[PDB]
Coordinates of C-alpha atoms in Angstrom, one line a residue:
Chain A
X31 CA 62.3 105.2 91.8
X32 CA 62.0 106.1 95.1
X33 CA 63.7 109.2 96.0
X34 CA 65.3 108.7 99.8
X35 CA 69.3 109.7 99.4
X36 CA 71.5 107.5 101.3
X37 CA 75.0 108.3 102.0
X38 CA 78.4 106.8 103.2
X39 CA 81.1 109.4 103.7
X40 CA 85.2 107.6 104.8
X41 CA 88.7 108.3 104.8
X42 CA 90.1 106.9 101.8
X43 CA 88.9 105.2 98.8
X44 CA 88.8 101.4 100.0
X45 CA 86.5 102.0 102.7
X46 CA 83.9 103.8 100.5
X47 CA 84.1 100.9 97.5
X48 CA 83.5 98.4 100.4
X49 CA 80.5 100.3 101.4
X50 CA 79.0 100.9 98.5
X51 CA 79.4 97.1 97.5
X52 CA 77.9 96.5 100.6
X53 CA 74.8 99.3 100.3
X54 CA 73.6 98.1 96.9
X55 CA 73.7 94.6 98.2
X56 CA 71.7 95.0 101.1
X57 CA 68.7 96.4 99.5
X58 CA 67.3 98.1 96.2
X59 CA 69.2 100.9 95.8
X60 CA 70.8 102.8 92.7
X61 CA 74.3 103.9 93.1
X62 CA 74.4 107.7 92.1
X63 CA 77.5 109.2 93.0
X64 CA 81.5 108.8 94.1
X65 CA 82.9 111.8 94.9
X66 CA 86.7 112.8 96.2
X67 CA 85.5 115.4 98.7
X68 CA 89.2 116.8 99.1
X69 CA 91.5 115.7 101.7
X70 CA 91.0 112.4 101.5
X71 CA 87.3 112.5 102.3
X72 CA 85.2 110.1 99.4
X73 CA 81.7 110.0 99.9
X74 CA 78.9 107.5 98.3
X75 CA 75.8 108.1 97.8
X76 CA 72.7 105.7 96.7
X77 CA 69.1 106.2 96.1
X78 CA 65.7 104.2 96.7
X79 CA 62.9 103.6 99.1
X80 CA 62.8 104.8 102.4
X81 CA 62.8 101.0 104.0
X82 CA 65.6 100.3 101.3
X83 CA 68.0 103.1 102.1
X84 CA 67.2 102.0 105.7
X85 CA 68.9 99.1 105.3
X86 CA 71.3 99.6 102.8
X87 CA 73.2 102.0 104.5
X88 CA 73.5 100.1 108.1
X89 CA 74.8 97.4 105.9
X90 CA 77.3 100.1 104.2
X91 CA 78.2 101.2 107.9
X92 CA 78.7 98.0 109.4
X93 CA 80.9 96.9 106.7
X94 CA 83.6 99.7 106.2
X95 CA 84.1 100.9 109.6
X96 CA 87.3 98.4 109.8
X97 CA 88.7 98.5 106.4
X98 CA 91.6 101.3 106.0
X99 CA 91.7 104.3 107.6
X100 CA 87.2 103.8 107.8
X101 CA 83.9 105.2 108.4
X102 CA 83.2 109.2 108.8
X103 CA 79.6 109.4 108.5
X104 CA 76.6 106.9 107.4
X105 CA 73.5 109.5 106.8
X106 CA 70.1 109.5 105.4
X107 CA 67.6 112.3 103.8
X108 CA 64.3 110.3 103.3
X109 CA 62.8 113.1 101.2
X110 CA 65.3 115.5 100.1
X111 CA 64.1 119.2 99.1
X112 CA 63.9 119.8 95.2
X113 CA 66.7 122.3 95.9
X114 CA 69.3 119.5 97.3
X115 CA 68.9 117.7 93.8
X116 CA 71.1 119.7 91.6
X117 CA 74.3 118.3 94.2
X118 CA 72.9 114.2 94.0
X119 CA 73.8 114.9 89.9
X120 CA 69.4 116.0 89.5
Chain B
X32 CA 66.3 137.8 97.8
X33 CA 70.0 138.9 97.4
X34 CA 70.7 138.0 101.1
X35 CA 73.8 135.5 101.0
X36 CA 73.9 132.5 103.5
X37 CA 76.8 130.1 103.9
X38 CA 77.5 126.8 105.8
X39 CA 81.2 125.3 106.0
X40 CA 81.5 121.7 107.0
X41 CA 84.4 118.9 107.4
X42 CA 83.4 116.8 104.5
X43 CA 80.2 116.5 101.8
X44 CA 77.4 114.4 104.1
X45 CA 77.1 117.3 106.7
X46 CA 77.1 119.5 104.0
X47 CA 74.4 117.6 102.5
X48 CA 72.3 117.8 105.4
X49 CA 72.9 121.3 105.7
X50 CA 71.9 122.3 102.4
X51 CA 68.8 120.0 103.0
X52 CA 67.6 121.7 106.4
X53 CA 68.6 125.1 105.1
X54 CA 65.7 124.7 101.8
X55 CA 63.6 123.5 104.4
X56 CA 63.6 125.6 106.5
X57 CA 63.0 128.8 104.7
X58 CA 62.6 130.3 101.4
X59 CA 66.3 130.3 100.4
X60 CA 67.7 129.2 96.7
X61 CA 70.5 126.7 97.1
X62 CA 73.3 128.4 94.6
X63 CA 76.4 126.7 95.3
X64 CA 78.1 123.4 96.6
X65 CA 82.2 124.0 96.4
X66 CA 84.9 121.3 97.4
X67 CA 87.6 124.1 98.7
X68 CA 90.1 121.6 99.5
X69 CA 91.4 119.8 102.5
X70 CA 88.2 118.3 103.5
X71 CA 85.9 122.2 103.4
X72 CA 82.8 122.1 101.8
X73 CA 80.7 125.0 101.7
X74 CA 76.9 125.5 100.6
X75 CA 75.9 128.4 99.8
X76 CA 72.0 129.7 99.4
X77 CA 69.9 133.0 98.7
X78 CA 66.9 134.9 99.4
X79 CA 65.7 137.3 101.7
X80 CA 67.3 138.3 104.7
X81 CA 65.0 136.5 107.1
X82 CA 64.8 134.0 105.2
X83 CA 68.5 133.3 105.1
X84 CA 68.7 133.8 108.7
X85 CA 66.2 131.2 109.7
X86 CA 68.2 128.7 107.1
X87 CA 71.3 128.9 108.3
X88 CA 70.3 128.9 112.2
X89 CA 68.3 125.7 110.8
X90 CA 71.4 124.4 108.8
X91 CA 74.1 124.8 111.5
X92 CA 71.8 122.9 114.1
X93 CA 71.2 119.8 111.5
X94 CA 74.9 119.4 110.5
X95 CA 76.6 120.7 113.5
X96 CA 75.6 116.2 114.8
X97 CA 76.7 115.0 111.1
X98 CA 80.3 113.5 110.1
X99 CA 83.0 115.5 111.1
X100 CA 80.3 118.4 111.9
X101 CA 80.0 122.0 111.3
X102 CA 83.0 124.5 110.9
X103 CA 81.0 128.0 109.5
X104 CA 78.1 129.3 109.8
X105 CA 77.3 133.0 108.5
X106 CA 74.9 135.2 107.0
X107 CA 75.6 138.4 104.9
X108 CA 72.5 140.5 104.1
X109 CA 73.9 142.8 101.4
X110 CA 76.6 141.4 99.6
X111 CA 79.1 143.8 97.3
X112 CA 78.0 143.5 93.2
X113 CA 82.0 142.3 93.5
X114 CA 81.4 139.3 95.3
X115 CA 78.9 138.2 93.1
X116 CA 81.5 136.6 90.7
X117 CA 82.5 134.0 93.9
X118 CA 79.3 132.7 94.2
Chain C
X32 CA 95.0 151.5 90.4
X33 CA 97.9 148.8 90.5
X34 CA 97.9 148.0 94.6
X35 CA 97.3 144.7 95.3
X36 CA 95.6 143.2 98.6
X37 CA 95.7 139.9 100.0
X38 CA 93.7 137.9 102.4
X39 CA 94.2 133.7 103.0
X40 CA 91.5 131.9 105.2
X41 CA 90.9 128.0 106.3
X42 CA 88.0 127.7 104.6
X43 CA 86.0 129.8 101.9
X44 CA 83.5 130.9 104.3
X45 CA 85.8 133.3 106.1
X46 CA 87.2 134.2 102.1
X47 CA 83.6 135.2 101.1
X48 CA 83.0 137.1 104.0
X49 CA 86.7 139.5 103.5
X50 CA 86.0 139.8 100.4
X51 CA 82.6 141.8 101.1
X52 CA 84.4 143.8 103.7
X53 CA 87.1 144.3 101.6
X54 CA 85.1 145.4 98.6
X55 CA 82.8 147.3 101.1
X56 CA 85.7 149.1 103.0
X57 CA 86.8 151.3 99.3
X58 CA 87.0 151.3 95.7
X59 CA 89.2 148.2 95.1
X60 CA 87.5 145.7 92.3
X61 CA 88.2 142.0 93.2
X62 CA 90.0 140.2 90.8
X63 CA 90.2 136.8 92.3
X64 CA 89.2 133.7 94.6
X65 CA 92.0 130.9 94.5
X66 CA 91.6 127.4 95.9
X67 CA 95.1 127.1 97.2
X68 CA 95.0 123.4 98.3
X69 CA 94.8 121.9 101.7
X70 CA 91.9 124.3 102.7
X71 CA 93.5 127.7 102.5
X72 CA 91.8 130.0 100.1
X73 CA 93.2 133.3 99.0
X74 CA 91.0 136.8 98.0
X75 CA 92.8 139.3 95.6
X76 CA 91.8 143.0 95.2
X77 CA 93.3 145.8 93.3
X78 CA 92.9 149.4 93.4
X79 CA 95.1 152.5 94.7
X80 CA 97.2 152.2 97.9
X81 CA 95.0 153.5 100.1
X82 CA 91.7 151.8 99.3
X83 CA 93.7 148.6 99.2
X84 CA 95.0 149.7 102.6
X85 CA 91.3 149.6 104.2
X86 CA 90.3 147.3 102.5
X87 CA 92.6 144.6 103.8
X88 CA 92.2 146.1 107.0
X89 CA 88.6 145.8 107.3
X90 CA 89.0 142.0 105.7
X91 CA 91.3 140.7 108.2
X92 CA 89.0 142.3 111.2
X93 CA 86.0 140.8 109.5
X94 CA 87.3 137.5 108.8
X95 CA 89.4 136.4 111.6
X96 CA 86.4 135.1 113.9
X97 CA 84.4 133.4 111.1
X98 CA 84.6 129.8 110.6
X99 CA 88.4 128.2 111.0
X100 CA 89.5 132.1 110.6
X101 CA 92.6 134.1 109.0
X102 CA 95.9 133.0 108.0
X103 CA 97.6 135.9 106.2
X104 CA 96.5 140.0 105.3
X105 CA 99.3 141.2 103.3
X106 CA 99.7 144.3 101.2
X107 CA 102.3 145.0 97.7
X108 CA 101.9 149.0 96.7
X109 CA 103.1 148.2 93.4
X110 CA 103.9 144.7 92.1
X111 CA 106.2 143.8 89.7
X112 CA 105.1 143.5 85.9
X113 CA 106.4 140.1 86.2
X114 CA 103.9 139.1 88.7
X115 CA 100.8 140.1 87.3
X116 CA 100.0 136.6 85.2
X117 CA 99.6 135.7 88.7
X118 CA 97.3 138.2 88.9
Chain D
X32 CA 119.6 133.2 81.7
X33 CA 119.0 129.7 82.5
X34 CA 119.4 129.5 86.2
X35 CA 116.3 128.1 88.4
X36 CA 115.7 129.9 91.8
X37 CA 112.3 127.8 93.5
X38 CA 110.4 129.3 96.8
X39 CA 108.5 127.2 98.4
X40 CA 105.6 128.3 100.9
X41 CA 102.6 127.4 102.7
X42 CA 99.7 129.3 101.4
X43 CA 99.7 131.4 98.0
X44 CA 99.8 134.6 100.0
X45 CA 103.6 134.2 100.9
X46 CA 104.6 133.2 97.9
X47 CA 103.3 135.9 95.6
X48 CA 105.0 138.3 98.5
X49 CA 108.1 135.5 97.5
X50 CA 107.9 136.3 94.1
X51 CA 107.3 140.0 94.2
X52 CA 110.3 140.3 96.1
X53 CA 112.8 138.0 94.0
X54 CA 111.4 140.0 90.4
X55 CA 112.3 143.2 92.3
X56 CA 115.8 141.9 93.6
X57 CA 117.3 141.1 90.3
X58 CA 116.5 140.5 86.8
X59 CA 114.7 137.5 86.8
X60 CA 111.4 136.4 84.9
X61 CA 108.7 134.6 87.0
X62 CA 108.4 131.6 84.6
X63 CA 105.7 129.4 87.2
X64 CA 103.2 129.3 90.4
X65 CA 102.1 125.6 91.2
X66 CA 99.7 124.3 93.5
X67 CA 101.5 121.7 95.0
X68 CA 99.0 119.9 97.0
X69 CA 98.4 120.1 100.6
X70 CA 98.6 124.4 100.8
X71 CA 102.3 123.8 99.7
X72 CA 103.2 126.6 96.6
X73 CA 106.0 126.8 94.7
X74 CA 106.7 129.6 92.7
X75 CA 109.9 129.4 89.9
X76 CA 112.1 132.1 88.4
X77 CA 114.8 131.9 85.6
X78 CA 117.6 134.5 84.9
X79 CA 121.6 134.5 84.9
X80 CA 123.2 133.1 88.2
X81 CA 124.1 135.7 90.2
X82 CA 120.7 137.4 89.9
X83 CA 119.1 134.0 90.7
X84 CA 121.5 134.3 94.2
X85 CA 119.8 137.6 94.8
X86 CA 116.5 137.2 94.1
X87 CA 115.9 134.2 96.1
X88 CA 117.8 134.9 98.8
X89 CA 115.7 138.1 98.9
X90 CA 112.2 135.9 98.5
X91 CA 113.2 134.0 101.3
X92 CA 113.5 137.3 103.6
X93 CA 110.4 138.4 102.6
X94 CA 108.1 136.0 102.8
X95 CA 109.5 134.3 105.4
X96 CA 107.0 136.2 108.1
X97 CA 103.9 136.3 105.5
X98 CA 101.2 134.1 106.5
X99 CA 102.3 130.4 107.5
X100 CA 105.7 131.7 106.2
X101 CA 108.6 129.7 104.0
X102 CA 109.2 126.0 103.9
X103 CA 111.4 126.2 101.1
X104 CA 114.6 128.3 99.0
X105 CA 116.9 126.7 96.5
X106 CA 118.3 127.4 93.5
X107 CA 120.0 125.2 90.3
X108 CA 122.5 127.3 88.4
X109 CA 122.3 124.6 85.3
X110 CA 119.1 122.3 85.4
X111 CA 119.4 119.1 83.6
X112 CA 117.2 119.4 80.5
X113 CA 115.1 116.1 81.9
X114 CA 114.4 118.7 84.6
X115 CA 112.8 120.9 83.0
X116 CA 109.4 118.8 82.3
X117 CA 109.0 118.6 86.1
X118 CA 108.8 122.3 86.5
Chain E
X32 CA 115.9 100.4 79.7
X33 CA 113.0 99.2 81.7
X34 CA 114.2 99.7 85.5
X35 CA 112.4 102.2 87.6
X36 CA 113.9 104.7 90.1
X37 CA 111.1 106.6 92.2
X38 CA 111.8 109.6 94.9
X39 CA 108.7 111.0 96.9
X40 CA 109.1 114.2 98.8
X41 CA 107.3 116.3 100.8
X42 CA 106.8 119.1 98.5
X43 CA 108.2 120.1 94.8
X44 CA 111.0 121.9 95.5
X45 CA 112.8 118.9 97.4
X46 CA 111.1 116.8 94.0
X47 CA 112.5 119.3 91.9
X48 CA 116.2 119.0 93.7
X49 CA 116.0 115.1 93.6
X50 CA 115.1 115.4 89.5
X51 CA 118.1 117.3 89.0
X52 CA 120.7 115.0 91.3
X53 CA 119.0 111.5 89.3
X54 CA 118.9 112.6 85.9
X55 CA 122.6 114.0 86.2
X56 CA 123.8 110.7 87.9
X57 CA 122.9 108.3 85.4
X58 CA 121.7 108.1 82.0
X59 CA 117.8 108.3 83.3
X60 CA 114.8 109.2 81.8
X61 CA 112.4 111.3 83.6
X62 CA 108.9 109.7 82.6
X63 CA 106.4 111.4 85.1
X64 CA 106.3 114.2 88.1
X65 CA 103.1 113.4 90.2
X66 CA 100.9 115.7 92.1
X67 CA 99.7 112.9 94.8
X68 CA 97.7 115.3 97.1
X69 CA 98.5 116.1 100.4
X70 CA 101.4 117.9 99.1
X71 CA 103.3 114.6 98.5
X72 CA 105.5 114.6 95.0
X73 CA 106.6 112.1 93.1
X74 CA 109.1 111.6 90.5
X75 CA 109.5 108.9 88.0
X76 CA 113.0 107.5 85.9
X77 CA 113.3 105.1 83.8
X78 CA 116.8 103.2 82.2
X79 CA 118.9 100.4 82.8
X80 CA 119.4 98.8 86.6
X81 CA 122.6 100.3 87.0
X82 CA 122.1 103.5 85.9
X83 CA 118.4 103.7 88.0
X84 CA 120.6 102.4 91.3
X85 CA 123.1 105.2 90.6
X86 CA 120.5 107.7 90.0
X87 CA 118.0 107.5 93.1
X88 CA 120.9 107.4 95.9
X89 CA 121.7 110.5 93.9
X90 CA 118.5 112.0 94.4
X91 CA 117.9 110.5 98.0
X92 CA 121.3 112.3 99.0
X93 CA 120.6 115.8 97.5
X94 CA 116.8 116.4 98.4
X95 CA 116.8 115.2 102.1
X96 CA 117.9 118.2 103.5
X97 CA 116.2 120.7 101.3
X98 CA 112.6 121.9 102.3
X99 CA 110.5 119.4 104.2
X100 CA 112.4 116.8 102.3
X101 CA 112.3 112.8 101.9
X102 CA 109.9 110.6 101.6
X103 CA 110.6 107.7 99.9
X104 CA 113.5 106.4 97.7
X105 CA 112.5 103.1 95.9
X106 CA 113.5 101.1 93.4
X107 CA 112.2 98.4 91.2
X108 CA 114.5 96.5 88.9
X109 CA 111.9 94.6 86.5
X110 CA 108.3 96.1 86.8
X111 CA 105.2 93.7 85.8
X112 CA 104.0 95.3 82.4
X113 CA 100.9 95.0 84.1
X114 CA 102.0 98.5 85.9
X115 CA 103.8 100.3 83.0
X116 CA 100.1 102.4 82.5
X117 CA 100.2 103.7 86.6
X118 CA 103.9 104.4 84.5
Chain F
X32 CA 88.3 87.5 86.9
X33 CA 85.8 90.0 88.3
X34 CA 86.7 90.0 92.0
X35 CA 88.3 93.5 92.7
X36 CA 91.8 93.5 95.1
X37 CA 92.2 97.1 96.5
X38 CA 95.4 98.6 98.2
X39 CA 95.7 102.1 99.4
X40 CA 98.9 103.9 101.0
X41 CA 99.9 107.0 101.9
X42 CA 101.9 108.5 98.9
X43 CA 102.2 107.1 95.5
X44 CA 105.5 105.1 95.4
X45 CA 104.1 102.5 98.3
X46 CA 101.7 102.5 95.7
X47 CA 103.8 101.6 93.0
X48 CA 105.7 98.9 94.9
X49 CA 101.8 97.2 95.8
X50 CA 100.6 97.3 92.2
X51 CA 104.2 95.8 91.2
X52 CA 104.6 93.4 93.6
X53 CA 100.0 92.5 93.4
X54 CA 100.7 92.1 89.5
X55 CA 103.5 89.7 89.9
X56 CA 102.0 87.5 93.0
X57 CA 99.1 86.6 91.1
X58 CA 97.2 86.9 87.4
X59 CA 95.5 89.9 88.1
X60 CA 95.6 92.8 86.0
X61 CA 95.8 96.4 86.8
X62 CA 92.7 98.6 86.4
X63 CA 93.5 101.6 88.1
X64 CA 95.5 104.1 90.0
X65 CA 93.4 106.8 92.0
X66 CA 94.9 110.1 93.5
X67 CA 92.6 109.9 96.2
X68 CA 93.4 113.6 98.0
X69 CA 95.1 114.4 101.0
X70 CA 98.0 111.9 100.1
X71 CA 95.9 108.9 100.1
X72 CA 96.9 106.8 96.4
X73 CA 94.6 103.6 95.4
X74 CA 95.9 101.0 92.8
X75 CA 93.0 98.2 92.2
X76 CA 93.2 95.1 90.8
X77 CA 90.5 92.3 88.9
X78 CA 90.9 88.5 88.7
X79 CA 89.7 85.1 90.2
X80 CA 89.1 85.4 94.0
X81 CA 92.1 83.2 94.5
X82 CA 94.2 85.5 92.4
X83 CA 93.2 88.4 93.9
X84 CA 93.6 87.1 97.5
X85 CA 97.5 85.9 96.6
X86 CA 98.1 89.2 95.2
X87 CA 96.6 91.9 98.2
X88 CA 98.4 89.9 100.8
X89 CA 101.8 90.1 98.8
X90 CA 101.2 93.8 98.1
X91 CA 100.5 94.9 101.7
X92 CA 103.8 93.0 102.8
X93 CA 105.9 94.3 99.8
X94 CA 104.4 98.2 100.4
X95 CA 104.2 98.4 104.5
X96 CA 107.8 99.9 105.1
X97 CA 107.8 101.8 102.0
X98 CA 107.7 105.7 102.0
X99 CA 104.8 106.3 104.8
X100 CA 102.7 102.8 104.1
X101 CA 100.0 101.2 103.8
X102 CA 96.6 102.3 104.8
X103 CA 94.4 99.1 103.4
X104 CA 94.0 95.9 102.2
X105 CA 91.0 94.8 101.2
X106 CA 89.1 92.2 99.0
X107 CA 85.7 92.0 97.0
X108 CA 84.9 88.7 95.8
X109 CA 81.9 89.5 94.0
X110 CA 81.4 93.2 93.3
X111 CA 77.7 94.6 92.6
X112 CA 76.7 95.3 89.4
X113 CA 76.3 99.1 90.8
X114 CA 80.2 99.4 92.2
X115 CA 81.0 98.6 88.3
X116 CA 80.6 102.4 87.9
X117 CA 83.4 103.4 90.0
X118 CA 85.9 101.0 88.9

């Protein structure tokens, strides 16, 4: 339960199932969202400890920057504000 | 606050970051997270007016280094009862 | 009033911020924010020919420097009954 | 009538400046307004044949310089009632 | 029948145009009209080889020249059942 | 099988023509068909690894030259438990 949000944003679909396969192997970390962002933007988004995050989302990074059309942004918010929650689903 | 500040970014992890400098930043209520289509995203927060302003100087600086970065940035400090609806 | 007004952006930022000016400008009551697809976004007013007049005016002024800016300002006096459910 | 008379347009502004101008034009009824995808929309009329000529023929004109302007005028006198689910 | 006859266009009016052409060709069945984003549209028939082969070099022929046209004209003769649901 | 075979193109009938041709390469069955936005369309498959493996590679031949193509091809041979979620 620890409340760092990690997140994986690519151009397509494939890329952001290969990172998120990739995040929640790396480390301890919940997968909380998928989201088609609009023009063919899909973003990921996991949560756990600070350390945990760390890692995940390098692992994430690393793995979907080849696969289709790839990565856009690899991002983390080690403590985000109570005001964020309401767009990680609360 | 009824002060109205808005940041529009190419995809949702700059607007992520935005939001989260933004409530940060200053006393501002974050109201509104809209997929507009095409890839826009816009945030959108209240308070007072110099509140808002610090948050979106603060928000624009975070994201403007994040994903495919910042597109709008924009305060408005009295915003019509007719608007209201939109956000 | 029956006028209509019309304002398109890239992006909803630059929407938000014509509809306030528009809204500001005269009496003209907005009726509507469409997400058109691909990132345009439209604003609708309505209200008597002259109000919708400025306010379009003052819109498309407001707008056209704000985020990924303006795309069309277009005014119909008096639409046709048959186009109101898109209305 | 049972003609079809389609305008197709980039951004909803000129095709509601389509549509106002193919109602007006002849007597036709404005029967749909999709969102196509992309910022393409389509807007559909129905009437007898010659009116369908007129009024899209005059949609075309109008809209033509509105916004990011026309992409598309075409009409089917008779569509094929498998047709008519794709409308 | 269980052939399928597919046209993708670049917009609906062009879909709309290739719909009409393949469903008046050949004793087809339209089954689906797709959305895809992007402002990509698809349509769907379904009948016997023949009729399918008739059909979409109908609809490749009548929609290529009409808006921002032609995509795709496809056909597969015996699709796994494994797909008939994406059907 | 639980490995996951994933093909996306741009436009949904290089989609079809993958998910036909992935279906028929190998015993894999069909478990979805996502309209992605801006034009990108995923079909995903589950089966044994070796299944899955035979059945990408035929579908990213059989889809490449089809409407506007293929954007990926891509296998997981053990999906987390997590990814479950979005499948």
């Amino acid at each position: 339960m620890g409340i760092a949000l990690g997140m994986i944003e690519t151009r397509g679909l494939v890329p952001a199932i290969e990172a998120a396969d990739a995040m929640t192997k790396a480390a301890e970390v919940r997968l909380i969202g998928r989201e088609f962002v609009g023009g063919g933007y899909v973003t990921v988004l996991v949560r756990g400890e600070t350390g945990a995050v760390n890692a995940a989302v390098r692992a994430g990074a690393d793995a979907c920057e080849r696969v289709g059309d790839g990565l856009v942004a690899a991002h983390i918010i080690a403590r985000p504000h109570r005001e964020v929650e309401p767009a990680l689903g609360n």
